[PDB]
């Protein structure tokens, strides 16, 4: 009464144009109602007749109806199983080379459903050469079509390094960036930013996205009302920012990031801090710009607000470290940290339950802050010296014993470096000396690491300008290691070594 399936299957399996043509229309109509659709599926003979004729037909009207049938079947989880087993995936991929627009939509949407809720559909699309076809079709201009196409690429690229490389080889990066700076349809931009996000953790795709103009193209959508689009852009930008220290025209992006620091959302702030840290690292220009738009003030605020969330402070402290040295306004930034009540919270971050990455970052910042004479006293009063010395004592004793992320040598250099700058102040020199550090500093002259030698000879040089300290350095037998260091290939090491041997007369 309601199931005349075997009759229609035989009619689709005919060596005639108009017979196959007319039957495909009537089958397409049965899939439109959510009751007779269950009859088309669960019948393997019927679904195979469709897959065959769709891949074989030469009429325009027939290719649309057959493809729409599978599209209608793919909405139900038991339809996807029929299309997969019927061998529809290899046919639909060949159908991506179709000249007519309307059919492509049906083909791509069906493959999209298969990729989402059918086991093994990802593999089968890859092997049928679906990737190359999907990338090459990124030059189309229908926004709904492109949204499904980019999502297909995201599903196929996610957690699959081989696919990311093929997308790269087929000029994927450039095409996806182009979408970001042209189209403004939210759903397309979202799925497109999700593809780029997946691609951005690939070490070969990453530079390609950067070189195509990805950083800026992603920066365009950060003030956009859509939150899921903004977040995905941020995530991608973070992955990319370590390979972006050369890119120019960054002013707009840098300004927007400083503003995004004031956001209520942790994910937004975390990313903003991270991207800034990476872009301010060793790039002279970005350091200047970020300071000009109130980067210090926003970052201190960020750290103060963040508390003990190390995901926020670690990149924010790193950015602060970058901004407090080696640019025209570095002194200004050093003062600004103090003037925005940042010094106490900075010193606090040297104490537990802080982990090693944050401590390394915090130490390097204090080193920079201590370059400004007006920071000498407050850093002393907050207790930076005794804590730095404790990190130094413990890290050194870990080097002798024959842990997480960073090596203790980096901590040894960091603290001694920090103390070398602090020892510029006479009152700091007293505190440093009173903590029995002279013995440790002398032993540090024996270090194979030249950077440790330099900061060790540096702090000792600073301390040796006082008579009482000079005697202690001599008493610890520093003469022998210092005279060795007079001949170092490192001029800094040799200069300080001379200055200490000078003062011990």
């Amino acid at each position: 009464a309601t199931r005349a399936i075997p009759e229609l299957t035989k009619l689709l399996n005919d060596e005639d144009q108009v017979v196959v043509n007319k039957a495909a229309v009537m089958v397409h109509q049965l899939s439109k109602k959510e009751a007779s659709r269950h009859a088309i599926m669960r019948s393997p003979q019927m679904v195979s007749a469709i897959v065959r004729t769709m891949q074989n037909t030469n009429d325009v009207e027939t290719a649309r109806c057959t493809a729409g049938t599978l599209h209608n079947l793919s909405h139900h989880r038991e339809g996807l199983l029929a299309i997969f087993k019927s061998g529809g995936i290899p046919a639909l991929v060949k159908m991506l080379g179709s000249p007519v627009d309307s059919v492509l939509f049906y083909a791509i949407t069906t493959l999209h459903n298969l990729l989402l809720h059918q086991e093994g559909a990802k593999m089968a699309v890859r092997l049928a050469g679906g990737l190359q076809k999907m990338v090459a079709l990124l030059n189309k201009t229908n926004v709904k079509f492109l949204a499904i196409t980019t999502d297909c690429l995201q599903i196929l690229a996610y957690g699959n390094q081989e696919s990311k490389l093929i997308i790269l080889a087929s000029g994927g990066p450039q095409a996806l960036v182009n979408i970001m700076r042209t189209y403004t349809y939210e759903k397309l931009l979202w799925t497109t930013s999700r593809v780029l996000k997946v691609l951005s953790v690939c070490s070969s795709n990453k530079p390609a996205i950067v070189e195509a103009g990805g950083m800026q193209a992603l920066g365009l959508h950060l003030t956009d009302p859509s939150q899921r689009l903004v977040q995905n852009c941020l995530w991608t930008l973070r992955n990319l920012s370590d390979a972006a220290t050369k890119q120019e025209g960054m002013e707009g992006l840098l300004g927007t990031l400083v503003q995004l620091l004031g956001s209520d959302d942790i994910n937004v702030v975390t990313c903003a801090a991270g991207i800034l840290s990476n872009l301010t690292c060793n790039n002279y220009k970005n350091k200047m710009m970020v300071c000009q738009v109130g980067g210090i003030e926003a970052l201190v605020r960020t750290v103060l607000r963040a508390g003990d969330r190390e995901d926020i402070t670690e990149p924010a402290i790193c950015a602060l470290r970058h901004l407090t040295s080696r640019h025209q306004e570095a002194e200004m930034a050093q003062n600004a940290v103090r003037l925005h009540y940042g010094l106490p919270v900075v010193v606090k971050l040297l104490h537990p339950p802080s982990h090693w990455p944050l401590i390394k970052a915090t130490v390097g910042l204090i080193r920079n802050l201590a370059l400004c004479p007006a920071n000498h006293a407050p850093l002393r009063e907050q207790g930076a010296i005794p804590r730095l010395v404790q990190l130094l004592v413990r890290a050194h004793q870990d080097t002798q014993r024959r842990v997480e992320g960073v090596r203790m040598e980096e901590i040894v250099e960091g603290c001694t470096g920090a103390l070398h700058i602090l020892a510029r102040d006479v009152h700091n020199r007293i505190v440093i000396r009173g903590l029995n550090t002279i013995p440790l500093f002398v032993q540090l002259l024996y270090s194979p690491i030249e950077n440790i030698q330099r900061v060790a000879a540096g702090v000792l040089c600073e301390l040796a300008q006082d008579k009482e300290a000079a005697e202690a350095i001599e008493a610890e037998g520093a003469t022998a290691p210092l005279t060795e260091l007079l001949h170092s290939r490192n001029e800094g090491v040799a200069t300080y070594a001379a200055a200490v041997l000078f003062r011990m007369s």
Binding site: A4, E7, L11, D14, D16, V18, V19, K22, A23, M26
Partner: peptide
């Protein structure tokens, strides 16, 4: 196209319209 093929065509087109009366 042939004598018998055109008979096959029209008898196949009639079957489509016969099932259309069955459902609706």
């Amino acid at each position: 196209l042939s004598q018998e093929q055109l008979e096959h065509r029209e008898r196949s087109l009639q079957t489509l319209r016969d099932i259309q009366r069955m459902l609706a």
